[PDB]
Amino acid sequence: EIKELLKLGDLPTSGQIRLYDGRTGEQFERPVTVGYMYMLKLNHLVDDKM
Amino acid sequence: QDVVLGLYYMTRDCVNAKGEGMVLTGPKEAERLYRSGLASLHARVKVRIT
Amino acid sequence: TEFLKPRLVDIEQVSSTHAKVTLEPLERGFGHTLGNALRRILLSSMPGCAVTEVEIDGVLHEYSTKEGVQEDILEILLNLKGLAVRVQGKDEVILTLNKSGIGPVTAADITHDGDVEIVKPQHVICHLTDENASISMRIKVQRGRGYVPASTRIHSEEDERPIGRLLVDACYSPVERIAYNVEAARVEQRTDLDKLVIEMETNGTIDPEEAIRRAATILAEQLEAFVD
Amino acid sequence: TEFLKPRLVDIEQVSSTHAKVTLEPLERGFGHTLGNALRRILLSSMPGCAVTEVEIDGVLHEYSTKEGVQEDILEILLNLKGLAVRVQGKDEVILTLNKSGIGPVTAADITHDGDVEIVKPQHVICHLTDENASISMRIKVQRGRGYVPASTRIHSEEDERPIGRLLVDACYSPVERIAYNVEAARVEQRTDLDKLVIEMETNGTIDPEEAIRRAATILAEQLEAFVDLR
Amino acid sequence: VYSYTEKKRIRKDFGKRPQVLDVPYLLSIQLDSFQKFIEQDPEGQYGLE
Amino acid sequence: KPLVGTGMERAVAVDSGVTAVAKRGGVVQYVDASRIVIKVNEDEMYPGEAGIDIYNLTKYTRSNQNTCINQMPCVSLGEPVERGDVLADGPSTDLGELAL
Amino acid sequence: TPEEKLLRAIFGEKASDVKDSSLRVPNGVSGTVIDVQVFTRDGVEKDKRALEIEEMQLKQAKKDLSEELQILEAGLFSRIRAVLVAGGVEAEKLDKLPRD
Amino acid sequence: REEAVVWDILDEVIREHPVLLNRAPTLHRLGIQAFEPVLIEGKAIQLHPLV
RNA sequence: GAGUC
C-alpha cells in the first residue's frame, strides 16, 4: 500500500533519489533514501548541562 | 563504522564499470580520473607502482 | 553589505614539483565553493602538450618484444606518457630517438631540435641490455587539452592509421595532484570564517605558483560577460 | 587554442518569485564548477531587505496579550519578518502600520511611503475583531546579507534600546530555493556546447537578472586576490 | 460523515480492522477512585461511610 | 502536525485535557487570544441559566520542568462547532492532534 | 587587616555596615523578564512597587468580571427576546427603548 | 568583561598544555586520556572518532 | 525522576 502511494506521489518506489553533494556538485554514486520524518528535541539541554 | 565503509567501498571490485582495462603510470593519475568522473573506483586495472 | 578580502600568507615549496599554500581568511563556506571549482578546472580543462603516437621501425605493433630491451613495448609506452616537454610556436612536432648498445636510454639522447626544450634529462625510458640491441623511432607530440585516451579518438576517426602506427594515451595536463583542507580560521572575534590550505603537485616544467594564476585567469575571462 | 566566452542568454520570469536563466556557451566541466559556486554565493551573500525592529504601542514585551488581536505577539512578529520589501536609495527605513475597525490587515493597510515598495501587498498580517479595536505600530526595515538574528545584535549590543522596542530576527537572504542543471545547448553546428540552466525562486525582493549579475560580481572580486599576488 | 474539526483535518486511516467500541477516556481511573471516596451512598461501604 | 501518525494522536490530545473542548457547541461569538466565547445551540440550551459558555484560555505560564504552557485558539470567529470540538490547543497540539 | 584599615582612610569611602544580598541572574542563562509577583508580609507596610502591582490586580479583576457580567447579561436579555418575539411582534420600539 | 585580548593570552597558556578526558565507567587505564585541547565556541566538547 | 555504557 505504501509503494502504491509512492506511485501516486510520482516518486521512486524505493523512495531513493540521485542527489548532488552541495559541496562538490559531484552526484552520489548511489541514489539515497530521503523523506520526511517526525523529530523531537529532548529536555536535555547542553545549556544547563555545561 | 564510517571509516570501514569508505575503505570497503573503494577496495571492492566490480564488473567492467567505467574504464575496465586502463593503464596508469602511478596513483595520482587514478585520483584525477576518478575526480573527473571518467573512472569508477571499482574498475579492475593495470597500474605501475613503486 | 560587507565582502571579505583575503590576503596571501604561506607558500611552502616542499619541492619544485610540490607546493603547499595556506590562505586566509575566507568567508563561511566559500572555502568549499572555491576549493572545488578550482580543482575541477585545474585537472580536466587544462591545455597541454605531449606524446600522441610512436613509430619504431621494426616495431609495427605494440605487443611484441624486441630482444635486448628488458621492458615490453606496452610498459615503455606508459613511461613515456609522463615525460615532459616544452614547445614554442609550433603545433605538431616529431622528435627522433636513435640509440645503441648497453644502458638505460635517457631523455638526453633525443635530437635537441631548435624550438624544443627537453625538461627532464634524467627520465629513464627503456633499458637496452646487450650492445647489439639497437633502437630507432619517431615520437609524435601534439598540442591539445586535458586527457584523452586512445578510445575517445578511435570514436570518430576516419583517419585510418598505417602499419604499426602506434597510438598512445595523451596526457596533456601538466597538473598532477590537487586538494584542499578547510580548517575554521577564526579572525579575531569572528569564528565562523575559514582557512583554505591547498596542496598541489605538478609535472615539473610549470611552477606550482604559475599554475594558480593561470587557472584563476581563465575563470575571469568567462566572468567578463557577467561583471558588466 | 581558443577559449570560449560564455554569455548571459535566456532570462525567463515565471512567477514574481520564480525565474529561469540560461547561460551558454559553456564548455565541459565548467557547467558543474560554476553551478555549485553560484548556489553557495547566491544564498549566503545575497543582500536583501528584511524587518529589523518593531514598536507596537501599549505592548512592552512579546509574550503578553492585547485585546482585540487574533494572533499572539510572537506570531505576528513571525508574519512580518517574512514580508517582502523593496527599498530604494536609503539603507534603513521605518514604515507605519495604522489601521482601525473591522477586518483583516494586509500589507496594503500599511500606509505607503515614497521610496518604499511592498512586493507582496496581500500578505496576511493580523485580523481585527472588535470594531473599536485598532492598531498603531512602527516597523523598521533594514538592508543586510545572509542571516542575522536579533540575538546576535544583543551579542554586541551598544544600541541599548528602550524597553518597548522589539528587535526582530532577520532572514535577509531573499533566495528561497536555488538549483542548476547542466544540459546540452543548441548551437546550430557545434556539438561541444552546453548550457547552464539556473532554476530560481525567491521572495520577490531582488529581480532575477539583477541578482545574478551582482552575484557574479562579488565572486569575481575575490578572484582578484589570487591572480594578482603571484 | 464527520464533524467540523475532522472535516478540517482528516487523516487517512490504513487500519484494516474496525475498532468497535471507543477508546475509553484514559484518565478515568483516578477520578473514579477519588470520587468513590466522597460518594454519597448510604449502603455502599466505602470511603467516609 | 505529525504526518505519519496512528490516528491515536487525536485521542491523546483530547484526553490530556490541556486543550479546550466545547461543552455545548453552537456558534462562536467572540474570539480572543485569551478568551473564547460561545453561543449555544438552542436545542441543547438549559431553561435554567443563559446559553453562554465561557472559555478563558491559559497563556504562557511556567511548568515544573521549566517548560512553557501556551494555549492557542483553533477555530475562527463566527464559526460552527459541535459538542466535543477542539477549540483551543495546548502547546504540543495541532487542530485536534498531538503535535509533539 | 591593618592594610585595609589604612586604605579605607586613604580613599575615604567608609561604606556603611551592609552586605549585598541581591538576587542576580545565574550565568550562562539570559532572557526576558515577562512577569513579576510580590508577596508582602501582613505586618510590614507595602512598597510602592507593591501597591502599583496590586492595583494592577484590581484593574484586571474588575475588567475581567465586569466583562463577564456584561456579555452574560447581553446573552440572557437576547434570549428573553426570543420568547417575546413569539406571541408578540414588536421590533421597532422595544430595541430603541430601554433594556431592563 | 570578556575581552578579545583575554582569549589571545588564554590560548598561549593553553598552548602545549595537555588536558585530560574522562568517561564513566573508568574500566581500564584508557578511560582517562590526555589531549592537546583546542578551543571552540559552542557548549559541547569534541572528541576524536578513533578513541 | 532521567542520561551514559
Side-chain angles (χ1 to χ4, degrees):
Chain A
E1 297 171 331
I2 302 157
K3 268 204 221 157
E4 226 169 356
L5 164 52
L6 264 155
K7 272 191 190 80
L8 222 73
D10 264 45
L11 322 161
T13 74
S14 41
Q16 308 177 337
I17 252 246
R18 276 169 305 267
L19 288 217
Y20 291 71
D21 182 13
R23 302 181 293 149
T24 62
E26 299 178 6
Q27 192 179 254
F28 304 102
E29 271 158 298
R30 14 170 50 227
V32 163
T33 312
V34 190
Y36 294 60
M37 184 177 309
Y38 210 59
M39 282 296 78
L40 271 156
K41 172 171 178 184
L42 283 177
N43 187 21
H44 297 291
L45 259 189
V46 71
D47 283 64
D48 289 327
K49 291 189 165 185
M50 167 207 84
Chain B
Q1 219 132 322
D2 283 38
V3 201
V4 174
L5 175 46
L7 301 171
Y8 193 57
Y9 200 109
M10 308 172 61
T11 46
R12 182 142 178 162
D13 36 24
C14 170
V15 168
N16 30 61
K18 258 198 284 103
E20 203 173 58
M22 301 179 78
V23 231
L24 285 205
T25 78
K28 329 77 176 166
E29 207 173 343
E31 172 165 22
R32 162 155 60 121
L33 218 192
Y34 160 65
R35 293 222 182 180
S36 315
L38 227 157
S40 186
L41 301 170
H42 327 300
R44 271 155 236 168
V45 215
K46 309 196 172 181
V47 192
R48 189 184 210 196
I49 266 331
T50 326
Chain C
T1 299
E2 282 168 7
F3 47 82
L4 159 66
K5 253 194 184 187
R7 92 110 58 237
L8 150 79
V9 192
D10 183 270
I11 332 166
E12 179 146 314
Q13 194 173 161
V14 151
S15 200
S16 56
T17 188
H18 186 92
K20 269 188 168 182
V21 178
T22 74
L23 225 291
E24 66 170 341
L26 296 186
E27 214 141 17
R28 47 197 195 98
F30 299 77
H32 293 264
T33 312
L34 339 193
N36 183 57
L38 285 140
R39 194 179 57 86
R40 292 188 80 81
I41 315 171
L42 265 140
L43 308 192
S44 70
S45 316
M46 241 323 287
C49 280
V51 215
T52 317
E53 295 187 51
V54 188
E55 195 182 352
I56 329 58
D57 63 327
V59 172
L60 311 172
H61 54 93
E62 27 178 359
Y63 324 101
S64 61
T65 187
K66 209 161 187 279
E67 195 216 319
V69 172
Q70 260 191 67
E71 286 95 354
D72 286 9
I73 300 182
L74 327 139
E75 174 171 356
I76 312 153
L77 264 184
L78 283 276
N79 281 352
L80 319 188
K81 287 174 188 178
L83 207 26
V85 280
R86 155 129 292 99
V87 193
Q88 291 193 350
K90 312 195 178 187
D91 295 333
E92 226 174 340
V93 278
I94 301 201
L95 282 219
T96 73
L97 175 53
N98 258 53
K99 199 54 161 31
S100 307
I102 300 190
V105 207
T106 151
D109 287 318
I110 284 297
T111 47
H112 161 74
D113 201 8
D115 59 330
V116 166
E117 210 179 11
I118 346 149
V119 152
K120 231 180 148 212
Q122 90 205 36
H123 188 93
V124 177
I125 298 145
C126 356
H127 292 78
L128 267 172
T129 63
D130 63 343
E131 77 153 43
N132 171 73
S134 292
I135 205 52
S136 186
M137 106 280 354
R138 320 187 254 292
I139 313 75
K140 180 165 282 192
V141 179
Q142 298 164 13
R143 181 192 278 174
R145 37 205 175 274
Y147 190 100
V148 159
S151 47
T152 270
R153 312 155 167 270
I154 194 63
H155 207 98
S156 69
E157 205 179 9
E158 47 260 335
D159 189 29
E160 171 213 310
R161 263 164 331 289
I163 303 183
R165 213 67 222 240
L166 306 145
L167 145 74
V168 212
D169 316 7
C171 355
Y172 297 87
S173 282
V175 204
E176 199 100 0
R177 161 163 100 164
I178 165 188
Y180 67 84
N181 297 352
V182 264
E183 309 191 329
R186 194 206 170 284
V187 74
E188 304 296 322
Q189 297 324 279
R190 310 323 180 197
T191 32
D192 202 8
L193 305 323
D194 51 14
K195 290 168 191 167
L196 203 44
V197 184
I198 315 243
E199 310 196 17
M200 151 136 302
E201 191 163 12
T202 160
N203 189 27
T205 311
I206 299 141
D207 224 50
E209 310 178 21
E210 202 125 15
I212 292 44
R213 286 196 253 186
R214 276 205 209 167
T217 292
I218 310 190
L219 170 45
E221 197 104 345
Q222 311 271 305
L223 295 173
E224 194 200 64
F226 323 101
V227 180
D228 259 7
Chain D
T1 315
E2 200 111 331
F3 290 92
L4 285 15
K5 303 179 177 96
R7 49 210 84 213
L8 147 68
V9 196
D10 201 329
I11 329 174
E12 195 185 10
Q13 189 188 33
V14 154
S15 199
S16 57
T17 180
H18 189 56
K20 261 193 177 192
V21 162
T22 65
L23 222 287
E24 50 173 326
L26 269 195
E27 199 220 331
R28 170 183 119 92
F30 299 88
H32 283 286
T33 304
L34 329 199
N36 244 296
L38 275 144
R39 188 176 91 121
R40 320 199 84 84
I41 308 156
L42 279 147
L43 266 164
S44 49
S45 288
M46 250 322 287
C49 320
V51 191
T52 300
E53 298 191 15
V54 166
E55 197 198 355
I56 316 169
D57 69 323
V59 177
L60 291 171
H61 59 85
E62 18 185 357
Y63 312 106
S64 81
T65 188
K66 207 175 177 186
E67 180 162 355
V69 188
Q70 267 254 37
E71 275 97 11
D72 275 8
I73 341 194
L74 265 155
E75 200 172 13
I76 290 170
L77 276 194
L78 274 271
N79 273 3
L80 327 180
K81 304 161 198 177
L83 210 24
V85 197
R86 287 174 82 175
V87 169
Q88 282 196 341
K90 305 163 86 187
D91 290 3
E92 168 221 305
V93 253
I94 328 197
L95 245 222
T96 42
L97 191 25
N98 237 54
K99 208 51 187 33
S100 313
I102 330 158
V105 186
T106 35
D109 282 8
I110 307 168
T111 53
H112 171 256
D113 190 1
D115 66 322
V116 194
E117 209 162 315
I118 314 173
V119 155
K120 204 167 305 180
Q122 47 197 341
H123 189 76
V124 177
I125 301 163
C126 162
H127 301 77
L128 292 137
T129 64
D130 166 16
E131 68 197 2
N132 206 19
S134 92
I135 202 115
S136 186
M137 67 182 71
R138 299 183 263 281
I139 305 139
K140 211 191 298 168
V141 190
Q142 296 177 19
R143 203 154 150 173
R145 70 206 310 244
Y147 178 62
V148 168
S151 37
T152 329
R153 194 171 335 244
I154 207 172
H155 198 89
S156 81
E157 215 184 53
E158 29 190 13
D159 197 27
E160 203 272 347
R161 304 163 328 268
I163 330 73
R165 208 115 211 178
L166 268 180
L167 185 53
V168 180
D169 308 309
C171 299
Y172 265 133
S173 168
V175 215
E176 167 116 337
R177 192 160 59 73
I178 190 165
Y180 77 72
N181 232 0
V182 177
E183 311 183 31
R186 220 193 112 117
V187 191
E188 278 176 33
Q189 198 184 325
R190 285 231 222 181
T191 43
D192 34 291
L193 286 193
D194 76 319
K195 62 190 162 192
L196 212 53
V197 157
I198 297 131
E199 293 186 24
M200 141 167 337
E201 231 165 1
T202 41
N203 55 164
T205 308
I206 316 280
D207 273 326
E209 209 178 25
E210 185 175 339
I212 294 126
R213 210 163 267 161
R214 280 224 209 94
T217 310
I218 310 214
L219 107 86
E221 193 87 28
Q222 302 307 343
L223 312 170
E224 241 197 56
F226 339 129
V227 179
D228 251 31
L229 217 86
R230 284 96 160 240
Chain E
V1 203
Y2 300 87
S3 91
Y4 290 77
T5 39
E6 299 180 1
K7 273 153 180 153
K8 289 173 204 150
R9 182 166 288 178
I10 323 171
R11 169 175 311 279
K12 179 184 177 179
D13 201 352
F14 278 65
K16 291 91 185 186
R17 305 289 163 183
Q19 47 189 34
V20 164
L21 208 85
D22 318 346
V23 201
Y25 193 84
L26 318 178
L27 312 180
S28 164
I29 352 144
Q30 308 298 330
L31 7 159
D32 291 350
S33 175
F34 172 82
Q35 223 160 29
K36 264 200 96 173
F37 189 90
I38 314 156
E39 178 192 47
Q40 173 80 11
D41 186 24
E43 62 177 350
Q45 58 168 191
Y46 283 104
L48 287 140
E49 309 275 344
Chain F
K1 45 210 152 179
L3 323 163
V4 266
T6 62
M8 289 280 293
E9 286 54 26
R10 184 161 287 96
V12 169
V14 183
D15 278 45
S16 35
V18 78
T19 52
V21 161
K23 264 194 177 189
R24 313 199 190 182
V27 152
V28 201
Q29 181 220 339
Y30 192 56
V31 177
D32 217 5
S34 64
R35 212 194 327 278
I36 285 174
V37 311
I38 171 171
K39 305 205 184 209
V40 192
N41 273 320
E42 257 205 320
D43 332 325
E44 187 144 3
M45 206 184 301
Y46 292 75
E49 68 164 27
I52 309 158
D53 270 327
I54 152 193
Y55 299 89
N56 278 43
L57 296 185
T58 59
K59 290 270 204 168
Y60 301 111
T61 304
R62 155 173 211 269
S63 75
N64 310 289
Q65 270 108 357
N66 304 337
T67 83
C68 138
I69 289 199
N70 159 231
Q71 296 177 321
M72 51 179 278
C74 321
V75 276
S76 173
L77 212 27
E79 287 207 335
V81 274
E82 312 163 5
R83 156 155 193 113
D85 269 20
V86 215
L87 312 180
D89 281 322
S92 212
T93 40
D94 220 3
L95 247 141
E97 273 160 2
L98 192 60
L100 310 152
Chain G
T1 186
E3 293 64 22
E4 283 165 317
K5 295 152 57 183
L6 163 62
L7 225 41
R8 172 181 207 174
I10 306 190
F11 270 71
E13 252 205 354
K14 198 194 167 191
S16 48
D17 269 356
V18 176
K19 230 165 157 194
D20 164 8
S21 35
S22 298
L23 192 80
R24 299 193 158 183
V25 184
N27 207 298
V29 175
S30 154
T32 328
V33 164
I34 161 185
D35 212 351
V36 191
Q37 294 276 41
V38 163
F39 291 161
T40 157
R41 168 134 319 287
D42 204 349
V44 205
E45 172 190 46
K46 325 163 124 202
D47 272 301
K48 171 88 205 271
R49 192 78 197 209
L51 168 79
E52 87 176 329
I53 281 217
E54 284 186 336
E55 217 78 18
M56 259 181 55
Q57 279 188 33
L58 305 200
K59 180 193 170 98
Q60 298 290 312
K62 300 175 179 185
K63 195 172 149 204
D64 254 39
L65 281 208
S66 281
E67 289 218 32
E68 197 156 331
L69 173 88
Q70 279 182 28
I71 302 203
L72 209 46
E73 173 193 344
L76 202 49
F77 259 82
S78 287
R79 209 201 156 178
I80 307 187
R81 205 167 161 188
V83 169
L84 318 164
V85 149
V89 198
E90 266 294 315
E92 274 191 310
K93 270 154 302 59
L94 290 196
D95 310 8
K96 289 159 195 179
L97 273 182
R99 300 266 157 275
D100 72 336
Chain H
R1 280 190 210 202
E2 288 176 46
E3 302 205 25
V5 262
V6 161
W7 305 101
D8 263 41
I9 309 166
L10 179 46
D11 205 10
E12 199 169 37
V13 172
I14 296 167
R15 177 151 178 85
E16 292 310 319
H17 210 92
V19 196
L20 300 158
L21 296 182
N22 156 45
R23 179 205 205 288
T26 300
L27 304 145
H28 52 304
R29 74 174 186 167
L30 295 209
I32 298 193
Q33 285 182 76
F35 293 75
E36 170 180 336
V38 177
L39 308 174
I40 86 137
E41 8 201 57
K43 295 127 199 175
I45 323 139
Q46 296 202 330
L47 186 50
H48 198 93
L50 268 179
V51 274

